[PDB]
Amino acid sequence: VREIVHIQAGQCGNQIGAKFWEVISDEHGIDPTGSYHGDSDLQLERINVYYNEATGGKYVPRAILVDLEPGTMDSVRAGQFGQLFRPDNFVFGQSGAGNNWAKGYYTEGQELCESILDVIRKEAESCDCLQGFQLVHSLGGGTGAGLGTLLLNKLREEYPDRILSTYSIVPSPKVSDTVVEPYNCTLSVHQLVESADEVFCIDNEALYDICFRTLKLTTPTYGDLNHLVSMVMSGTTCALRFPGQLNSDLRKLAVNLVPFPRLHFFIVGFAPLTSRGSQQYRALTVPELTSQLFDNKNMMAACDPRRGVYLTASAHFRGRMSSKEVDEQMLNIQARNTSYFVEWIPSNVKSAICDIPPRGLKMAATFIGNTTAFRELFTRVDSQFQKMYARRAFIHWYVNEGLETVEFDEARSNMTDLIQEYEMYET
Amino acid sequence: VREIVHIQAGQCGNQIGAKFWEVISDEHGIDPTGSYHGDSDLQLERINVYYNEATGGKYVPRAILVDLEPGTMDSVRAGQFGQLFRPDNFVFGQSGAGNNWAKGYYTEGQELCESILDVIRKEAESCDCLQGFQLVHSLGGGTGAGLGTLLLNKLREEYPDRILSTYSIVPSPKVSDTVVEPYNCTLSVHQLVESADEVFCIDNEALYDICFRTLKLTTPTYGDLNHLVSMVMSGTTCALRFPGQLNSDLRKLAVNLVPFPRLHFFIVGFAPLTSRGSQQYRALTVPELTSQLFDNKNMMAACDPRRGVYLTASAHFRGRMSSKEVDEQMLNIQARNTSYFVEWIPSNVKSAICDIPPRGLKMAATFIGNTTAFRELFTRVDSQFQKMYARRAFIHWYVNEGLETVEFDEARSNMTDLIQEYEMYET
Amino acid sequence: MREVISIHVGQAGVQIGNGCWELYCLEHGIQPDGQLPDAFNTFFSETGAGKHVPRAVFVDLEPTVVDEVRTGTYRQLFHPEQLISGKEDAANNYARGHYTVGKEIIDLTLDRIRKLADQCTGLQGFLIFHSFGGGTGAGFGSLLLERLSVDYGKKSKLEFTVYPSPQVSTAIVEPYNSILATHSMIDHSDCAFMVDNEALYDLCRRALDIERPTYTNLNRLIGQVVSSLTASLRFDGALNVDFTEFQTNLVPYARIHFPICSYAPVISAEKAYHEQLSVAEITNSLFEPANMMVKCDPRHGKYMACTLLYRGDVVPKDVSAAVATIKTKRTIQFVDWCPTGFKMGINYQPPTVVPGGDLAKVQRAVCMLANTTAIAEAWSRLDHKFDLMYAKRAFVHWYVGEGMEEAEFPEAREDLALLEKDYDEVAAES
Amino acid sequence: SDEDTLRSCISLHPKPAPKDQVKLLKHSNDILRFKCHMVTRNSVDASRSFILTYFMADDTIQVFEPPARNSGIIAGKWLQRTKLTNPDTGKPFQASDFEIGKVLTINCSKFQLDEATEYALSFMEADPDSFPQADLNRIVTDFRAGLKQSGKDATDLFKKFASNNKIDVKGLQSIFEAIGLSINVHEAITIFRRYSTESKPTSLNIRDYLSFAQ
Ligand SMILES: Nc1nc2c(ncn2[C@@H]2O[C@H](COP(=O)(O)OP(=O)(O)OP(=O)(O)O)[C@@H](O)[C@H]2O)c(=O)[nH]1
Ligand SMILES: Nc1nc2c(ncn2[C@@H]2O[C@H](COP(=O)(O)OP(=O)(O)O)[C@@H](O)[C@H]2O)c(=O)[nH]1
Ligand SMILES: Nc1nc2c(ncn2[C@@H]2O[C@H](COP(=O)(O)OP(=O)(O)O)[C@@H](O)[C@H]2O)c(=O)[nH]1
Ligand SMILES: [Mg+2]
């Protein structure tokens, strides 16, 4: 009884959310009509984690959907799992996205915020217990970055105790899909640092790179890209859903991985990943799993760990397996590469094992880590922001909404201090 | 548990290595698909030396494929045993070979070296132990001579203890397949002397000669020539793979046959060999094998031993025979021909016996020796080098890559001292 | 769901309107009578029975061009109220088309536009078509734009208008009218696109292999661009792009707004079999100066911001590689103070071909709108031509007699000079 | 080589073995291509499609894997042109051993032939002596003899075993099994190629089949 509330915002959040709800529906074995048709009683033990039950044995997910324009909403309606979602949980506006952070936060944000909050209050107060919230949104856009952070602050006010774990999309450094991203990203960073307990950063360039290097897909579409992200959310909350030899929920993750309140940005990785034709040659076991997890190419964020150093890291293993072999790998990988860990924190690598692996895979693992290599990510957006801010023109679109120019100075100042915060702990 | 890593670089090495894997697969009874369909339990004792196990009951070989152009890999994919190789082990460039040592070493070598090493590191650290590496390359070429020596330097840095045994083909003195070989050969030798523990030299002209003399072939192909090379390939590692009366591995071979750090270039030979119509009438026994082994015509390298003197020699015997018979012949062959052995080292002939002979042969033998006759081989390349080094114009192709001309002077100086080194030890 | 209203003024606007609406009907599958043998609500309204009615208004001060539609095949589709015709045209006079004759009909047309807006619950912007050289395109268009600015405020007013050609010209008084319309447009317009006939003639001759084009061929090429821009709102795609999204990224300043247009692939039926036309080929062709619908070389200037729209068989991964290759081109210039510069849109609905058309059936297509300082070359040419005529006062009496006070001539000259400064100070670097 | 082995046996000087110049010079440009797939337990490899190439000038088999998008497998030449010996017969492979529906063991891997190129089928038909599987007269005579022995009307067989009044390859096999005689998949396709009145020989018609049956 550790119910988790799912919240989606914007274009990216829904399409990732739509693909995410397919996977856990498959793992528990939920028919698209909402009726249970699975294959094991273990699926019904703690189905309360993600799904609610109606009168007619028809499982409805704890999902809330938010957008400024209905274009994204209707695509979800026609999706394969479209009938599953609760009809009243769809909350949407009737105005263009605008791709403006100030417009999304202030003008249309306030109108939707009051209606959205009561929608969440329906789901929040309908469970015997409520562990935390889970947000999927984009930072380069205007609706997810703007309205999502507004909802994030309000959620903290009403429910301070609960874990506000979020999944975010980081703008690409080489070529990106929006000009005004450095404004939107920097402004959202200031809200995210103080409010959100746990933030996972995901970059599209790594996703394209992983598919080309490993899976050998010539034309990897968004369906493939969102699916790789879809594993990670399923893996993290799996400890709640299934038994194991060492349980580790979200609150365990934050305690171990967060040494200081402001250093909580994380990198994630998933294993095993193999080309469809290559799998026959592989000898998938625990030692092979550890090889991919600590390999820098499997990281889903374009921040090479070797350029920085690690502080904390946590790994989960799924599947019936010897506990000893898992524990030995944590020791060997830590002692072998001591140059990338801080001396003043021993035992930087957490381990946990869960009984039931996902479909098709005899055992799978999930990696979540925290490292100073994020200083590369924030330097890229800072250098672009200064070139943005010197040419004071794009501020025009933000001023008309009502944003004061001092906020841009404030947003960079806090984010600048975040950069040097990672710098000093390297010593 | 003395695993050996095999690496194939270039056009020449890949074709020989492809023929090499056919023999090893045949001896152990491994299917081209990788399944085991052999006939004896003894084949499964120590297959770990050359093979890894896959999940689906297949066996994958410890082979890494290297070349600058994709043309050589596609033929390997078309090879009879092409499926056996691991798909990810194929690392290739996208540029012409160039037949240039400087271009292979500097321009394309650095780009490939980083990618190749991590592929090697996968196999190197995936096994319980690793005794030595096994490289197949040509010296007259541009890819295997240039890049092969580069990887040889890096392998020594990471793995100083392991035996870096290599197999090389020497440019022919009468007619050869490339004009600029003495440049490529001279540069390679300086890397070869200091880095590699064991080097066996092979000459194509002798491989023509033995096929015409003994095997009586008027249309021998590269299949027959590479097949003869593959015999010495399996014989040397045969002591690790099978039980015997007197075991002798690589490190035993290096200790006995190498009296001084730089005098380690070796000549190889195999017995028995017969015209394939006359094989019925041959009274093949242990003394008959001894007659072939020390016969100069059977030597795989075109450097007549009688013109120099011997320092060390070693022979292996495969099959069930008498221990006294093997030991007696080496005493007789040493005393009967004392004029070709140094007085200051007695017992110049090392022996070994292996229980299981190769398929089709009731017993077989392998001969490896070291002698001052190599001074003939280095004289041929050195004398040519002086002629075209005066005509400094060929260097302009190597100059454009970035090679500085004193490297030619440095390399010849080392080769000249190596020639002098064999001169002084004749006394 | 959400609606866009199209407004056409002048002979050119009505002529382009004819080509644009025939493409909409074929794409959606609507018969010319309004019946059928989705995104219909975006451009069309359901009359109650089977017929569909479009959201468009046709305006001209002379009846000939409007009466062609009234007697044409498409006459059944349109509402008689939407077809508004004056009595006598402006005779290539801005003053006549603004003060004397324009004000006779301005409030009549505005009622019909406002009446159409009542049915548009999700109206997000307007589309307006002009010919700068014509009297009605400039004089009447300025009066309509000024009214709509105060009538509706923060509603996007996007314009797609015909710029005078560098050398090809049909009206002598053209430099006078274009400058006068420049002053009214620059403050009120949210964003205005430029195309010129001289560039289209060369494109309609070289790439599309037709030796003797007419206005009819040029109008269909214009129609393709409008359909591509509106496709992201009409149909599904991996990356939806709205009008507001276009407005924010393309314009860096208030007065720099002017973008340019391009389209690819533009090819004949014969050459289609010889080229695969993947994402790499179409994107590379968009950047050559030959494909510009405005006859100005981008190499003279620099690029501020660009937008690409992809239709058909396009995978997002291949888009990133194509644009990344674009970034490596030293032949392309960007200002340092704008590093990203790109927004990409991918839509699944492929282009629709026309019976008796000029384009082959390409499975995928791409459209580009970009902002560049190269347009400053065009403004200088018009500025120099005007000065010679005004120095000797060659046509002032015609304008003054029709309500114009002469003080307007130096003021409209001054604002254009300020605008040329604006493009120059943007082109400066720090 | 093994050819050199025979030279060594025959003469004290192993004079070079003569290659069949008549066969090489005539049949240099003749190549038969066959589409095949693996019969293996691996689900991934079972879905891989291959094209087999047999050279008549020198009796070699070459196997190529066409590139497939989003397959994740490095396609290309799967087997070089090789002088391979049939494990079933102990003799070098010949063109008569290549039959549609016949499973061939190549590189001790198991391959099932699926389709053949238009020239390969036409060349096999043009020389019935070397390709009994394409000898239609033998098939027709055996079919007529079996029908007479069974005493079953062909019209009733057509009504019983045809789907939508058309006979598939499986349907023709079913009819042959009902009579009591075997038909190879190559023989059925030869029947379809000769008799079927469509551009692509995938089905037979009632009057057309009766002409073949009577
Ligand atoms: N590209 C293009 N331009 C056109 C077309 N028809 C007219 N034009 C432009 O229109 C200009 C002539 O002015 P008009 O077409 O009469 O426009 P107007 O504002 O209505 O002028 P008036 O008739 O006096 O009211 C020419 O210079 C053309 O550039 C057309 O079909 N295609
Ligand atoms: N990987 C992935 N990225 C997406 C998807 N949809 C949108 N994005 C990214 O989200 C970023 C901003 O999109 P935007 O429309 O502004 O989202 P929103 O305004 O927050 O709703 C773009 O750079 C896209 O690359 C998707 O389905 N998959
Ligand atoms: N014995 C033998 N020699 C070969 C084979 N393939 C190539 N060679 C020889 O290798 C020499 C140099 O070839 P090259 O392609 O430049 O070798 P690489 O560049 O070092 O890989 C030539 O003289 C060839 O005759 C083979 O299969 N067997
Ligand atoms: Mg007019």
Does residue C292 contact residue C260 with C-beta atoms inside 8 Å? yes
Residue given tokens 């990788």 in the structure block = B34
Does ligand 2 lie within 6 Å of residue A150's CB atom? Answer: no
Chains B and A touch (3+ CB pairs under 8 A): yes
The CA distances from residue C94 to A273, C137, C138, C402, in Å, are: 69, 9, 6, 9
Mutation test of the interface with chain A: which of D40, D42, D43, D44, choosing the one with the most A Cβ atoms within 10 A? D44
Helix (H, G, I), strand (E, B) or coil at C241: coil
> Which of C121, C119, C162, C135 lies closest to C17, judged by CA?
C162
Residue nearest to atom 5 of ligand 1 (CA): C12
Neighbours of A245 (CB within 10 A): 14
Residue of A nearest to D44 (CA): A277
Which of A218, A277, A278 has the CB atom closest to D69's CB atom?
A218
Residue C16 has which token pair?
A: 């382009």
Does ligand 1 lie within 6 Å of residue C136's CB atom? Answer: yes
Which of A215, A216, A277 has the CB atom closest to D44's CB atom?
A277
Beta strands in A235-288 (DSSP E): 244-246, 265-271
Residue D161 to residue D164: CA distance in whole angstroms: 10
Hey, are the CB atoms on D9 and B82 less than 8 Å from each other?
Answer: no
Partners of C240 on chain A (C-beta within 8 Å) are: 11, 69, 71-72
For residue B293, the 8-state DSSP code is H
How far D61 CA lies from chain A's nearest CA (Å)? 25
Residue B414 to residue B149: CA distance in whole angstroms: 16
The resolution, in angstroms to one decimal, equals: 4.2
Which residues have a Cβ under 8 Å from the Cβ of B72 and sit 6 or more positions away? Answer: B10, B11, B14, B15, B92
Which of A277, A279, A280 has the CB atom closest to D71's CB atom?
A277
Neighbours of A299 (CB within 10 A): 24
Partners of B60 on chain A (C-beta within 8 Å) are: 281
Chain centre distance of CA C280: 26
Residue nearest to atom 10 of ligand 3 (CA): B12
Residue B191 to residue A34: CA distance in whole angstroms: 70
Q: At what angle do helices A10-28 and A222-236 cross, to 10 degrees?
A: 60
Residue D182 to residue D177: CA distance in whole angstroms: 6
Does ligand 2 lie within 6 Å of residue A148's CB atom? Answer: no
Classify each residue of B43-77 as buried b or exposed e, where b means 16 or more C-beta atoms within 10 Å of its C-beta.
Answer: beebbbbbbbebeeebbbbbbbbbbbbeebbbbbb
Residue B321 has which token pair?
A: 């025979």
C245 is catalytic: yes
CA angle A190, A194, A196 (to 5 degrees): 105
SS3 of chain D: the string is: CHHHHHHHHHCCCCCCCCCCHHHHHHCCCCEEEEEEEECCCCHHHHCCEEEEEEECCCCEEEEEECCCCCCCCCCEEEEEEECCECCCCCCECCHHHCCCCCEEEECCEEEEEEEECHHHHHHHHHCCCCCHHHCHHHHHHHHHHHHHHHCCCHHHHHHHHCECCEECHHHHHHHHHHHCCCCCHHHHHHHHHHHCCCCCCCCECHHHHHHHHC
Hey, are the CB atoms on D14 and B31 less than 8 Å from each other?
Answer: no
Q: Is D68 on the interface with A (CB under 8 A)?
A: no
> Which atom of ligand 2 sits closest to the CA of residue A104?
19
- Secondary-structure breakdown of chain B: helix, strand, coil percentages, each rounded to the nearest 5: 50, 15, 35
Residue of A nearest to B84 (CA): A281
HSE, CB side, 13 Å, CA atoms: give it for residue C385.
Answer: 18
Helical segments of B37-127, H only: 71-77, 101-102, 108-124
Residue C102 has which token pair?
A: 């324009």
Partners of A280 on chain B (C-beta within 8 Å) are: 54-56, 58
Residue A66 has which token pair?
A: 């938010």
Residue nearest to atom 13 of ligand 3 (CA): B141
Partners of B115 on chain A (C-beta within 8 Å) are: none
Q: Is A8 on the interface with C (CB under 8 A)?
A: no
Residue C172 to residue C395: CA distance in whole angstroms: 10
Hey, are the CB atoms on D9 and B31 less than 8 Å from each other?
Answer: no
Partners of A141 on chain C (C-beta within 8 Å) are: none
Does residue A246 contact residue C342 with C-beta atoms inside 8 Å? no
Q: Which burial class, exposed, middle or buried, applies to C82 when counting CB atoms under 10 A from its CB (0-12, 13-18, 19+)?
A: buried
Does ligand 1 lie within 6 Å of residue C135's CB atom? Answer: yes
Residue A69 to residue A210: CA distance in whole angstroms: 32
- Gap from CA of A144 to ligand 2 centroid (Å): 9
> Which atom of ligand 2 sits closest to the CA of residue A137?
20
How far A218 CA lies from chain D's nearest CA (Å)? 6
Does ligand 3 lie within 6 Å of residue B11's CB atom? Answer: yes
User: Which subunits count as partners of chain D given 3+ CB pairs below 8 Å?
Assistant: A, B
The CA distances from residue D177 to B138, C318, D151, in Å, are: 62, 54, 14
User: Which subunits count as partners of chain C given 3+ CB pairs below 8 Å?
Assistant: A
Do the bridges between strand C364-372 and strand C342-347 make them parallel or antiparallel, or are there none, so unpaired? unpaired
Does ligand 2 lie within 6 Å of residue A172's CB atom? Answer: no
Chains C and D touch (3+ CB pairs under 8 A): no
Residue B211 has which token pair?
A: 């096929």
State the first-to-last Cα distance of chain D, in angstroms, to the nearest integer.
55
Does ligand 2 lie within 6 Å of residue A143's CB atom? Answer: yes
Does ligand 1 lie within 6 Å of residue C197's CB atom? Answer: yes
Residue nearest to atom 25 of ligand 2 (CA): A177
Residue A367 to residue A289: CA distance in whole angstroms: 11
Hey, are the CB atoms on D44 and A279 less than 8 Å from each other?
Answer: yes
For residue C131, the 8-state DSSP code is B
Chains A and D touch (3+ CB pairs under 8 A): yes
> Which of B249, B268, B63, B260 lies closest to B168, judged by CA?
B268
Q: What string of DSSP letters covers A26-74?
A: HHHTB-TTSBB--S-GGGGTSGGGTEEE-TTSBEEE-EEEEESSHHHHH
- Gap from CA of C367 to ligand 4 centroid (Å): 30
State the first-to-last Cα distance of chain C, in angstroms, to the nearest integer.
46
Partners of B210 on chain D (C-beta within 8 Å) are: none
Q: What string of DSSP letters covers B172-195?
A: PSSS-S-TTHHHHHHHHHHHHHHH
Residue B232 has which token pair?
A: 């010495």
HSE, CB side, 13 Å, CA atoms: give it for residue A204.
Answer: 25
* Active-site option among C245, C408, C420, C429: C245
The one-letter amino acid at C400:
V
> Which atom of ligand 3 sits closest to the CA of residue B13?
21
Hey, are the CB atoms on C248 and A100 less than 8 Å from each other?
Answer: yes
For residue C132, the 8-state DSSP code is S
- Gap from CA of C131 to ligand 1 centroid (Å): 6
Chain centre distance of CA B149: 14
Mutation test of the interface with chain A: which of B88, B120, B121, B128, choosing the one with the most A Cβ atoms within 10 A? B88
Hey, are the CB atoms on A278 and B52 less than 8 Å from each other?
Answer: no
How far D62 CA lies from chain B's nearest CA (Å)? 8
Partners of A283 on chain B (C-beta within 8 Å) are: 52-55
Residue B148 to residue B336: CA distance in whole angstroms: 41
Question: What residues pair up with D104 in beta bridges, in sequence order?
Answer: D111
Cα-Cα-Cα-Cα dihedral of C48, C54, C57, C63, to 10°? Answer: -90
Q: Provide the phi-psi class of D49: left if phi over 0, else alpha when psi is between -120 and 50, else beta.
A: beta
Cα-Cα-Cα-Cα dihedral of B21, B22, B27, B29, to 10°? Answer: 100
Hey, are the CB atoms on A276 and D69 less than 8 Å from each other?
Answer: no
The one-letter amino acid at A102:
A
Does ligand 1 lie within 6 Å of residue C6's CB atom? Answer: no
Partners of A96 on chain C (C-beta within 8 Å) are: 2, 124, 242-245
Q: Is D71 on the interface with A (CB under 8 A)?
A: yes
Does ligand 2 lie within 6 Å of residue A188's CB atom? Answer: no
Does ligand 2 lie within 6 Å of residue A225's CB atom? Answer: yes
For residue C334, the 8-state DSSP code is B
